Design a protein around this ligand. Structure first.
Ligand SMILES: NC(=O)c1ccc[n+]([C@@H]2O[C@H](COP(=O)([O-])OP(=O)(O)OC[C@H]3O[C@@H](n4cnc5c(N)ncnc54)[C@H](OP(=O)(O)O)[C@@H]3O)[C@@H](O)[C@H]2O)c1
Ligand SMILES: NC(=O)c1ccc[n+]([C@@H]2O[C@H](COP(=O)([O-])OP(=O)(O)OC[C@H]3O[C@@H](n4cnc5c(N)ncnc54)[C@H](OP(=O)(O)O)[C@@H]3O)[C@@H](O)[C@H]2O)c1
Ligand SMILES: NC(=O)c1ccc[n+]([C@@H]2O[C@H](COP(=O)([O-])OP(=O)(O)OC[C@H]3O[C@@H](n4cnc5c(N)ncnc54)[C@H](OP(=O)(O)O)[C@@H]3O)[C@@H](O)[C@H]2O)c1
Ligand SMILES: NC(=O)c1ccc[n+]([C@@H]2O[C@H](COP(=O)([O-])OP(=O)(O)OC[C@H]3O[C@@H](n4cnc5c(N)ncnc54)[C@H](OP(=O)(O)O)[C@@H]3O)[C@@H](O)[C@H]2O)c1
Lengths: 335, 335, 336, 336
């Protein structure tokens, strides 16, 4: 068991906690840092609009939240310099606040006694970025100390893109992610730096930018400069689909595109990328642990133009990818 | 034409602007104070998730927003002491920020050159509170200088309660308002001082407290101590219903309860309170200008226990009540 | 293993099937009658927009569906007279079509081999109506052969109405249930016998009738003529609350109303009626197995007027209550 | 006044009626055929969950509804053969039931007295298909008697596909339309021939087919075999976007793609196709009368791969396009 700390007990932080509880044999969360009182934090952990009730008992005091008898230390230092991770023998910190995506700032956790930091988001100045299943073999336990698990969408797109580029080659592609609304958006029309994300999220199709397609290049260098895209935020609370349209020099049919995915979606990689011929709708992939669920029923081909669609639970699927990455780091040298 | 200023260009502020444009012959909005840039403010005025597009042309510069050729001065003073309302000959300021519901603080607008302040909310230390149609005859143009238009729900409940208490007498009543979600609520589960309003608004029935039933006593003193209630926030963006269950010493039937409303819902009062026998659903009362739309089809009676239900557009219906109050003030002595 | 058949494999039928898999050791569903083809039936069983995926493999053919290796015989007979329940030795049929709530028609399942019929709905002409935890002890295994499990709302209302009446006496009460939309409402403005339920369900507060407060008299005769109410259908897919306002002759406080429910909400009754002081919203009671979750935080008192509020998963909570009734039935004599 | 009758008084029929009241001086609806009773018809006309209240008094009887003092004859004949359109001198029938998109069946309205039938949908065996603004000039008043106004998606796609093909040449293109749910989808998980549209519409992203990108070839023959796509149905009640990704042989930038649409989007064509640089979300195009609102802010270019996005109100925008086609028809000879 390697001991884990979470900085930021938001949606991603709480997902990660639950995912460890549900899915991990070799990690334990033993401390959390967040800016709120333990009554509030413990209530949000216990009850969730998306995931339902935590199955375990939750209690709290002024120092901690106890979950199924296991005491979780809770801190509220807004600067990670004031933390002491070594005091709880935390080796890995999950950096999920959203305000330390800069590795030069996330480094504070290591100064505060951790050995590894995993940023649950696109990062800057990081040692490395991983999409589990795609480039995790390149993790270097001595030199990759502050890393990034990339974005939900990148974790959906990159597995699919790896397989198709490997098999047919992708010249250029443009992505539309049709995505659940997220907490950056407004409930009612109100000021926002993005004048579209300003608009009432649960009654609008809301177009917004995302770096997730360009970010594929970080984990698949062969696709640098060849992918871009954007997001349409729509009224579901979780569950998203990545629609990629690309040009290939290969001569391709619907059936050969699908066969390539089916043939790759197997073994350990198939825990990242799944192949489905089912009549899927978003609610079917809620709490699905794959990073990418390829929908063979949606594949289209016109000439050398290809459209493929992969599903993802932008919360849970992403979190399970991050958990896979965390298990890898925890399985290798920690100093 | 009496010239009006709005402090706070949120949902209520923008509703009020539109209501003046659509419905008023004797008021004009000539200045606005708000903490945002004019590109953002002008975009939110022009496009609305609830009301649709403003029919008029909107332009802006760094000093103003011009609406159908009429230049609206815009300020961004966070303290109303720094404002100068007299410079634009504004007589009435609508105080719609939410952070000057204290009349001792709203008074600043009068020091800044206005003559009257109307708080678009339950207030404290106010000269008087009005529900138009219920107690507006008691407005005293010399001594009522900082006033309150009360809450959306109170504007729905008080008209109905006046008629029923007048005709049958109400001993005690308890209200449930089944209410559209509002901007105080969270889109995704997140910290909030109210741990229920913390929960994703568009997928939950969310119980929360409201003073609106006790506040009836401010405008109908005869009901002090006899009304209380709460709110169930539900997933519609606007449109609400007030369900009041009360005990009466009178012997009453469904048909006599309804006849009393029908008989009162007439003339000017009938612009506040309507009587309907239609098969209404919330979307039918969106942009309805009444404060209260009594639904005769929902009236129930068991013994001396009575249940009545009135609809309201918590945005537009409320705003039209506030506009009626503003026209009254504007029609009398301004000093 | 008491063998169960389901007539009508819609929301309630599929909930019942799942609840049997999840919560019963004594019951097994061996046969289903429904109007649809088996490809459709099996897809709707495998995948559920509310309950998520069934955690068991599903296959189908012209005659059956196989769930986790167990063959369920499937028929599609519009008329129950043309069924042979004896052919697979089913003893209890759950009648969940919606269209045979008249016991005079549902009786047809007994003629076709069943020993018992449980109507998943308010019924007419039935031997008996039950809210488990309230009056199930009056179940008569000789004379109660076609029975009603009453409605979702009744299964929420009756348990707290029993406790509070018994403690304080209810003079009259009026109820509003703020209720998830149901399958009979229209997605877009379209024809319906109820001109309000005609109206786009996911964007409207939709008022509609419910017999629930009057049907409580069937199970608590002491409350006959003392209750009425209506529903507001709102845009959530499941999860509901019943808001009851009543006047009493007793002297009551918030603390005293709430203490009455807490005392009673224990033991086996406590699996029907829960007592909560949690900050609940509707998603928190989705897939809750209680018929009634009393929300102590919502209790109000004004003179002699009392308001109380209880939650229910109108799908799963109701289904769990119905399973509790089915287990009771199946634990006694199944003659004939 | 050219007299119009409507067969099928559903979403599209009621939109058409309203659009005639709102935007036409030349057309008048004098008769309606629909399967429902007049109390229901008149209620659904008066009150609309999307469009709000009709601003006119509505009354009804056994034979008619009266809207702002004008009597509309109402029939309910399942079979168009039993209608007499001549009886009220209607010249154009809008065929909006959904079930007579085969011109071989819709022809029955001409036998029953109509001079022209306009099918509010993709059709089979029709004289002609039109997207107003794209190919309406080819309308032949002698030989085009039963015609299609094509689909909502086609009326969004074809206008920008015309402009960009003409300017740059489209090699192939694939489309996704992110589309408001429609009335055929199910509110709760329930049977449907499309097992995805079976699934609770207001809580799901629901993939489904559309002929729209292949139906563009009917109106722009130059694009035959070059377009395909599908729909994602999402939880908004109306408002949709068409996302088209195509590869071209030309050298194109974002600025150049966008400039091509701006140039073309003027005059009468500009009432079909708008050019926007606004920060649009779907509520902003609700009740917009254009068939296609090009969103310049969404244009992307990657090498020779181009993505463009246009909005449409799949109810009102489509209806306005159809009204534009009906006015055209009604401005020429109505013989026979
Ligand atoms: N769909 C998804 O949700 C998704 C998918 C992929 C990636 N991600 C990434 O995951 C990260 C987390 O996103 P989220 O959805 O979880 O957002 P969130 O719900 O707002 O979580 C962020 C949390 O950080 C806490 N926080 C902020 N500053 C802090 C500080 N100085 N010290 C301690 N705690 C602090 C906040 O606590 P308070 O609320 O008390 O301020 C908040 O609860 C982001 O970087 C996001 O881009 C999200
Ligand atoms: N259903 C309803 O909406 C409803 C019904 C009845 C009564 N009311 C009452 O109406 C009032 C307004 O509510 P709302 O729904 O309009 O909320 P809102 O949308 O948040 O509007 C409030 C606005 O005030 C602005 N503001 C805050 N502090 C300011 C300052 N110091 N100077 C200038 N502007 C400032 C904010 O601008 P920024 O956003 O840029 O910070 C915000 O846009 C509240 O008191 C509420 O209780 C609302
Ligand atoms: N919240 C709730 O859903 C709720 C709560 C409490 C009680 N109930 C009660 O439970 C009953 C079922 O409701 P529900 O929500 O499950 O509705 P539903 O989803 O429509 O279920 C009805 C099912 O019966 C089938 N069916 C109808 N007529 C049939 C016939 N003649 N032969 C065979 N199968 C037939 C239908 O097949 P098709 O789908 O092919 O038509 C459908 O699968 C109703 O009486 C309702 O009051 C419902
Ligand atoms: N977004 C859109 O809605 C959209 C956009 C573009 C094109 N369209 C097309 O427009 C057509 C109509 O669609 P819609 O959305 O308006 O569907 P809808 O709401 O179901 O309209 C169909 C109407 O036709 C009536 N009807 C059906 N069969 C009939 C018959 N034999 N005789 C008389 N009346 C009959 C129905 O009456 P009942 O209600 O009693 O069944 C209903 O009012 C479809 O072909 C569709 O593809 C729709």
């Amino acid at each position: 068991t390697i001991r884990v700390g979470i900085n930021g007990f938001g949606r991603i932080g709480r997902n990660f906690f639950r995912a460890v509880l549900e899915r991990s044999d070799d990690l334990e969360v033993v401390a959390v840092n967040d800016s709120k009182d333990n009554k509030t934090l413990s209530t949000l952990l216990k009850f969730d609009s998306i995931m339902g009730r935590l199955g375990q008992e939750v209690e709290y005091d002024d120092d901690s939240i106890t979950v199924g008898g296991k005491r979780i230390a809770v801190y509220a230092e807004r600067d990670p310099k004031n933390l002491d991770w070594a005091a709880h023998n935390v080796d890995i910190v999950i950096e999920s606040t959203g305000v330390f995506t800069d590795a030069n700032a996330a480094k504070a956790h290591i100064e505060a006694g951790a050995k590894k930091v995993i940023i649950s988001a696109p990062a800057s100045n990081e040692d490395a970025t991983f999409v589990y299943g795609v480039n995790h073999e390149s993790y270097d336990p001595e030199n990759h100390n502050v890393i990034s698990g990339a974005s939900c969408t990148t974790n959906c797109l990159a597995p699919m893109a790896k397989v198709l580029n490997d098999k047919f080659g992708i010249e250029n592609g443009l992505m539309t992610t049709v995505h659940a609304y997220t907490g950056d958006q407004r409930l009612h029309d109100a000021p926002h730096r993005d004048l579209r994300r300003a608009r009432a999220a649960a009654v609008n199709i809301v177009p917004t930018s995302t770096g997730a397609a360009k970010a594929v290049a970080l984990v698949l260098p062969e696709l640098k400069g060849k992918l871009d895209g954007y997001a349409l935020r729509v009224p579901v609370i979780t569950g998203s689909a990545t629609d990629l349209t690309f040009n290939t020099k290969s001569e391709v049919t619907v059936e050969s595109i699908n066969a390539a995915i089916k043939e790759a979606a197997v073994g350990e990689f198939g825990e990242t990328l799944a192949y489905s011929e089912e009549p899927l709708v978003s609610t079917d992939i809620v709490h699905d642990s794959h990073g990418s669920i390829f929908d063979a029923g949606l594949t289209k081909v016109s000439g050398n133009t290809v459209k493929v669609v992969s599903w993802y639970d932008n919360e849970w699927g992403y979190t399970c990818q991050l958990l896979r990455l965390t298990e890898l780091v925890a399985s290798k040298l920690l100093e």
